[PDB]
Design a protein around this ligand. Structure first.
Ligand code: CLF
Ligand code: CLF
Ligand SMILES: [Cl-]
Ligand SMILES: [Cl-]
Ligand SMILES: [Fe+2]
Ligand SMILES: [Fe+2]
Ligand SMILES: [Se]
Ligand SMILES: [Se]
Lengths: 477, 522, 522, 477
């Protein structure tokens, strides 16, 4: 389709809306121009969702508990408020870890204060204090507690900060109050920011004056990899084969101690910019630690990233960088040789959260595929700035896409594959369009690194070329 | 590394020696992990009677609940009405979760909207969100009805749904005639099943409260059926099938079986099937109303009896042999239709299967959980099979229900070693399956973590999970199954006996050690 | 010893120390057993490619066959007729075995008589046995038809069934008008499926050969359906259900579904349901005759084409998506009935399930066995699911059939690593699952011993059995299942994907070792 | 029922038959009189079955291959002839053993010559010779081979004896030809006799000149226990606690060497008289070894048997006998105390093969139950002699009962429980009568000995008292 056709598609789709919604949604849909460096000339983002239009977004609790805090494996995270939020988010996100669950690690468990009417009427701070003592008795090897606030906490005027301070002092325990109530902000995004500030205020400074850790010039931290199906592990391996020492992973398979040791590193490597740019900027400001964005989706980006990271260190790391690149060369080349012929020219539309809608484009292009439409649930304009140069001219961009819009765009564009979430999956399969989950990796992965690229290629091929897609029309009609 | 012709996903990739070594270095270098001997010590302690007693003293902490929140049930109830959009007034984060939860269980689309109330609504309330939300929803998704429930923010702030909806109509955001039934659904009261009851009673009120003057009980010659919170497709289907076989006129009120099972034929169908608005409007003209899951339909019952003047029969959930018999006999009495030869033969086929499988079932010990009506029906059927339902857990149960189940247990020698637990969670259940080990668990997918824990103590302590309930996320298409009626009983029986035989085959598969009992014929 | 509160059966009683010690003493004292090192060495050798080569060179020895003998099939065919007694002329030992074999599979009575020929009959033949046998059977069990087959003694001696039955009527042992169809069923030709074909063709001849003069093709406006040797109740049922939904007039010829599923209601019913004599007599007036399992209905086909003048369509067994489509389209063409909305929706629901489950099915490798039509339908459906049917074993297959299956494999990329084996047995298959290990076996209960063998080599080499076929003796009520049509495809799909997920859960259940991949959601 | 009522019942049932069948069946049905010692005055047995009447009997191959030879664990048994017989009898009988199946033991396998037309027309002797070589190659740890003849072998004039002799000498291997074709005799019974004579002629004499066995005064063999669900093991344990040494078990869990060592024992203990009296008489004649019948069903019979057996040895064994009896006293007393009140007065009808229809009566009586009818498939009059004193006055006896007879007797008698086989089980369950399999033990057992009595009691109770039996009548009919 041409720019003019995409513009007219946008206009036809928006005809359904009442005037107020139409005028708003027009500002969140655009036709890409890769010459643009200021996305605030072309698209609006990080605004409230219009009521009644079936946004795909979650809330600040999803962004804090679900995303940033929940993966930290040796702490206990309390879903504080009524029973819903903790139950729906229990083990839904594949933030992988090594541990003994219920004993020293707690990630897939649902701890909650299960608010009842009396907790709403009279407040939950007494219940929270009692809950903390009960946690200590029954889970003695926990290394810290977080309190993840659900909607009612702030609304009823509870003081979880006081409870955290008092109980933390009593038990000589790190207890972190997180004000991530879902009424705050407009999406998962403000939850990231809230969660980052809570790490800064309650955890990250514990070892500021403690110099027992023996540092090396090659110490780094992986910032913003939540280890989905092992993604952080298949990244970590490469960084350490390159001669670096990965002191911390934020927060996939993360431990409280590695978070506390992070201010001792020489370089913060940021994968998810959206969710952890806040704490990365803080660590540069306070500790003088530089940070850099990188991308481990597919061989082209992984190679570029390894080289850019290695360039921050000495010749010895740069030499190991090229050794790593040479090692994996035949492996990814074999992947390309097998799968690229099966996927060449196929067109993909994406819709994901705050990073992957741009970050995976390179991987698709390494298999000869074209990303013809992309968009984000909760990205900000700084994400869109990074997206416009990654997308082709005259491609479609959508911010906080409505269910209706996403369906209607797909009907006209007719992509060969869609990459989105669980609420999207079954709609598009019924339309006869191959679908891959690009949050959960459809229970597969890892997709990061060289080892991840093999699995990514296998997965896109198994689904796009599956025999089921030729069978949707009954031969008699 | 990867070998291109046998690519490894996470399992077993991370068992390669390089990944193993890397993970050991991460642990030792930076995780400050408790020594393995201490981890083992604490694990063993968590399997003890000493730990169980501390565990059962919890007053404030809940761990691994076996319940969800009200609006989840309101959404499910709403989905069962023709061209109806579930709409949850309040915070959008809730709706993403409700949809995903049901997406994962049914492997289907689940359509539901929010009106996206934010922090700003704490000053002024959510009135404008309702106005624009209803208008936007109607225009964009073209439902013929919007069924409104609430999230906890909206309840805490105190938004008056009735007034807000009325004002939306008065100010022209939607036509006066457009149906917008509503229910307050606070997540901090009861559970998901309570939300279903509240939503259903709201819809019933909407279509009947002001139009009672022209109604005559019995005049439409039908029986109303209210299924409650139900996540097996086969259960909606089996009830309709049995009533049709019997020649009984009926209206199933909330019937999502079409919309939760649309074909993959090249189009997405946002709405399919469902209870019609006319079926609700005409429901007071029925002979009577039967509640399939009475222990979460108490509010519905009060409205049906108080306003419709139907003499709702005292029937248990139609699960197992006796209660399916009682259901069919009551339906026969109400309708004047005899129980047909087809259902009599089906009954006898169930009884035949019971006679065929009784020797492997006899005395088998179960831990189980779920919603109150499902649990009591499972308990009843287990007793009918000569099984012992030793740990019966209903997190969202109440004292009156527990008394009812305790009486059922007292009616059978097979209930002698059984205890019913209310307000207790799966971390409580975990202790019980260590300290008083049953043969199997019957439960939802959250049970897999208990099985994992029991295996870690040793193979001889492992308690296998049999997946019956909600949610089931780790197997495919079990939502198509049936638990109600003779058909459901036949499915449950088959599942139980074959789970027993599978486990026995595992335990006797050892060459020259235990395979003396690896019989070809069982 | 026993503790009265917890009695131990053989497993685990004989693991008690006193029994272990006793069995060690028996072995050491009196068994002169090969040393364990030598047993281990020979076991390992039986898993090798060297051993497989020797194994596949067998010409005289058969080990663990996947077939039975002709009269078993004749008996099953005969049971599908109204008030019909299967009667096997020859040795009584055979009939005890036929009945017990079916008893164990269906968990139902199986009625069949012998005329108890003994050694003395080698001089003079079995004529008197037939005379008294027919008279006795008719008086005692009151059948409306006796359907006669043979055991191998009677074949070797050369008893002429036709003459013997004619002389029984001539001499007054049974009335001249009483139906006694017959078929020679030598166990040393073909297999149980051949017996079914021979029996059916005998019954068809009996009722139609002499009365062809008044028949007109198409005059009754029905389609005859011949199911062949079929041991899933769901398969008779689904075919009848689909044709009824279409409004297609039909006659199912040999229908044992009622007699193999009588209710347990306080009486024994020796006979129930079945194809009527009137249906067999009127069968030539059908539009056409469809064979559900053509690869063992070749004699029947020749009779139906040569005598009834029906142009039997070239249809594969209706298994999987494409072949169910083809069956329904051909039935539509013959009957003039359109395919109704109900079946179109069912088809799309199967396709939906395929889209939902394709990622776990993709590339999974299977070994499988069974009768020719069942095997080829399973292979076809596996290809449709994106699975690789790598070892395809049909003991009773033929060269023409193998060519047909090889063609099917050629039409799909998922057939590239597959080989079809005819004349080979489960000892042959055992070697293949060691040397070229698949992910699962799909087969009958005899497969359990192969799984046992694979586990003994190690857990990493274990090949789990998925039980689909005949006989299934070590699980209960699987004979109620369906493999034909969209319903059968849905059932097979569900069984396969959940077998995969069960195994994955086992492999990822290890605390802190493999449970990083023990996902709640799959 | 009275004698006259049972007599009347027999005549009424017989009315269905044509005259020839009627006159025959009348001779095979009797009302018990325990004052009779010569059953040849009361009942005819071991005759041909009447054609067309649905006898429950098997054939001589079942008696030889299925019963006597098949359980011998370290030999390979060939089902010689077409494919049916070996397949239907594969692993149908629960003759338990310890071994490594397919390597050193072969019991649950089906080895067959799978006769085709060319084998019938031209003979199977060449195929059998080739088959033997293939067995040796693929199963090198087999310690001998038997050739179990099916119907066609003798009919076509094959010479398996020649093949066995020639191949046996060539390979230095025991290869046993067994002429157990199903056309021979009238039932399983002649198969026993044929099988015993084959053991005598081809196996039992191998060590006649060997003096190396270290004999003791307490050496016995268990003769005629096929270890159904471990029955022989739960008998063996008691004999050895009493101080005896069990040199052999014929043939449950049996090895060829223990058969060959049997002529070295001091006493043959015969459980199944019907199947093994032949070889027991032979061993007394040739080797001077005495034999005695015993019964290990229930505590009363087991105690009586232990004492009678101990009486054959010295004071040391009689002392140990009383120690064993004292040890188990509290165990079986606990079984009786739990289960007898649940079973007292209940009435049973049995129909089994050649031993159990009399042998289990004492066990039933130890639980207060009454055996009101019994009978055998293939017993001889010496079995009926042993039966009439074990059964109550005026009880019903049936030899080679027809399906029709058994159903009609049950309809009138209305037993509380029936104990019979797989072909009977599902008929009687549909009639609402609790049924226990008394061949296979319904996949339970053992039932022999003290440990077996506990399982027997548990099983009769679980079935007779099961809640399913109150549910057969729909409440609306
Ligand atoms: S935005 Fe929670 S699911 Fe809701 S109705 Fe309250 S219990 Fe139930 Fe976010 S924090 Fe949570 S998920 Fe919503 S409530 Fe708010
Ligand atoms: S009395 Fe065998 S089952 Fe028969 S038709 Fe021949 S193959 Fe088949 Fe006994 S020995 Fe065997 S079981 Fe019978 S045939 Fe004779
Ligand atoms: Cl967990
Ligand atoms: Cl085996
Ligand atoms: Fe689906
Ligand atoms: Fe049955
Ligand atoms: Se857990
Ligand atoms: Se085997």
């Amino acid at each position: 389709m041409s720019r003019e056709e995409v513009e007219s598609l946008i206009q036809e789709v928006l005809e359904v809306y009442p005037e107020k919604a139409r005028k708003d949604r027009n500002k969140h849909l655009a036709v890409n121009d890769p010459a643009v460096t200021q996305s605030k000339k072309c698209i609006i983002s990080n605004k409230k969702s219009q009521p009644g239009l079936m946004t795909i977004r979650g809330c600040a609790y999803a962004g804090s508990k679900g995303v940033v805090w929940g993966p930290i494996k040796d702490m206990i995270h309390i879903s504080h408020g009524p029973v819903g939020c903790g139950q729906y988010s229990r083990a839904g996100r594949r933030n992988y870890y090594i541990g003994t669950t219920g004993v020293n690690a707690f990630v897939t468990m649902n701890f909650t204060s299960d608010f009842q009417e009396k907790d709403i009427v009279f407040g939950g701070d007494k219940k929270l204090a009692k809950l903390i003592d009960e946690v200590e008795t029954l889970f003695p090897l926990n290394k810290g507690i977080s309190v993840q606030s659900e909607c009612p906490i702030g609304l009823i005027g509870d003081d979880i900060e006081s409870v955290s301070k008092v109980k933390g002092a009593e038990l000589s325990k790190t207890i972190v109050p997180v004000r991530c109530e879902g009424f705050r902000g407009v999406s998962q995004s403000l939850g990231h920011h809230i969660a980052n500030d809570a790490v800064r205020d309650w955890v990250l400074g514990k070892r500021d004056e403690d110099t027992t850790f023996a540092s090396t010039p090659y110490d780094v931290a992986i910032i913003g990899d939540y280890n989905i199906g092992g993604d952080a592990w298949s990244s970590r391996i490469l960084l350490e084969e390159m001669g670096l020492r990965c002191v911390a992973q934020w927060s996939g398979d993360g431990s409280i101690s590695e978070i506390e040791l992070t201010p001792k590193v020489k370089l913060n490597l940021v994968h998810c910019y959206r969710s952890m740019n806040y704490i990365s900027r803080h660590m540069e400001e306070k500790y003088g630690i530089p940070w850099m964005e990188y991308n481990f989706f597919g061989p082209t980006k992984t190679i570029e990233s390894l080289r850019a990271i290695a360039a921050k260190f000495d010749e010895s790391i740069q030499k190991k960088c090229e050794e790593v690149i040479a090692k994996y060369k035949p492996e990814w080349e074999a992947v390309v040789a097998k799968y690229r012929p099966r996927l060449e020219g196929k067109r993909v539309m994406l819709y994901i959260g705050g990073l992957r809608p741009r970050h995976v484009i390179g991987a698709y292009e390494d298999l000869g595929m074209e990303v013809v439409g992309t968009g984000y649930e909760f990205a900000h304009n700084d994400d869109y700035d990074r997206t416009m140069k990654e997308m082709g001219d005259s491609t479609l961009l959508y911010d906080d896409v409505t269910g209706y819009e996403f369906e209607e765009f797909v009907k006209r564009i007719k992509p060969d594959l869609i990459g989105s979430g669980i609420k999207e999956k079954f709609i598009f399969q019924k339309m006869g369009i191959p679908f891959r989950q690009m949050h959960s990796w459809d229970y597969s992965g890892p997709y990061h690194g060289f080892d991840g690229f093999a699995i990514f290629a296998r997965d896109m091929d198994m689904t796009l070329n599956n025999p089921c897609w030729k069978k949707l029309q009954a031969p008699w009609e | 590394s990867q070998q291109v012709d046998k690519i490894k996903a996470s399992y077993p990739l991370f068992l390669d020696q390089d990944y193993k070594d890397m993970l050991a270095k991460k642990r030792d270098g930076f995780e400050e992990k408790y020594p393995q001997d201490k981890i083992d010590e604490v694990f063993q302690w968590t399997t003890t009677k000493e730990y169980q007693e501390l565990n059962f003293q919890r007053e404030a902490l809940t761990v691994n609940p076996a319940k969800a929140c009200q609006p989840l049930g309101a959404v499910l109830c709403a989905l069962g009405f023709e061209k109806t959009m579930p709409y949850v007034h309040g915070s959008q984060g809730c709706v993403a979760y409700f949809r995903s939860y049901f997406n994962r269980h049914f492997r289907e689309p689940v359509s539901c909207v929010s009106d996206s109330m934010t922090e700003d609504a704490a000053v002024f309330g959510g009135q404008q969100n309702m106005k624009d939300g209803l208008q936007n929803c109607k225009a964009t998704y073209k439902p013929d009805m919007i069924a409104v429930s609430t999230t906890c923010m909206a309840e805490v702030i105190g938004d008056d749904l009735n007034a807000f909806i009325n004002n939306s109509k008065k100010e022209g955001f939607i036509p006066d005639e457009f149906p917008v039934p509503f229910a307050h659904t606070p997540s901090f009261v009861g559970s998901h099943v309570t939300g279903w009851d509240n939503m259903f009673e709201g819809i019933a009120r909407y279509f009947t409260l002001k139009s009672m003057d022209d109604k005559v009980v019995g005049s439409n010659k039908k029986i109303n059926i209210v299924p409650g919170f139900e996540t097996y497709l086969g259960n909606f289907r089996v009830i309709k099938r049995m009533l049709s076989e019997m020649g009984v006129g009926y209206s199933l009120l909330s019937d999502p079986e079409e919309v939760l099972d649309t074909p993959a034929d090249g189009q997405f169908r946002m709405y399919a099937g469902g209870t019609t608005q006319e079926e609700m409007k005409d429901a007071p003209n029925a002979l009577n109303t039967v509640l399939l899951q009475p222990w979460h339909l108490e509010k519905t019952k009060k409205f049906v009896e108080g306003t419709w003047k139907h003499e709702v029969p005292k029937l248990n959930i139609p699960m197992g042999l006796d209660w399916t018999d009682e259901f069919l006999m009551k339906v026969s009495e109400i309708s004047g239709q005899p129980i047909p030869a087809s259902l009599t033969k089906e009954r006898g086929r169930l009884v035949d299967m019971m006679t065929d499988s009784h020797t492997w079932l006899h005395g088998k010990r179960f831990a189980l959980w779920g919603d109150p009506d499902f649990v009591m029906g499972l308990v009843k059927f287990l007793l009918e099979l000569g099984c012992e339902p030793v740990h019966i857990l209903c997190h969202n149960g109440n004292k009156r229900w527990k008394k009812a189940v305790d009486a059922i247990l007292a009616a059978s020698p097979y209930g002698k070693n059984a205890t019913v637990y209310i307000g207790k969670d799966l971390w409580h259940l975990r202790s019980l399956v260590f300290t008083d080990k049953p043969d199997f668990m019957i439960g939802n997918s959250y049970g897999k973590f208990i099985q994992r824990d029991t295996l870690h103590k040793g193979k001889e302590f492992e308690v296998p999970l049999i997946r019956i309930g909600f949610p089931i996320f780790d197997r495919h298409h079990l939502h198509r199954s049936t638990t109600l009626g003779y058909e459901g009983a036949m499915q449950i029986l088959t599942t139980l006996v074959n789970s027993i035989l599978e486990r026995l085959d595992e335990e006797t598969r050892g060459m020259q050690a235990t395979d003396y009992n690896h019989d070809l014929v069982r």
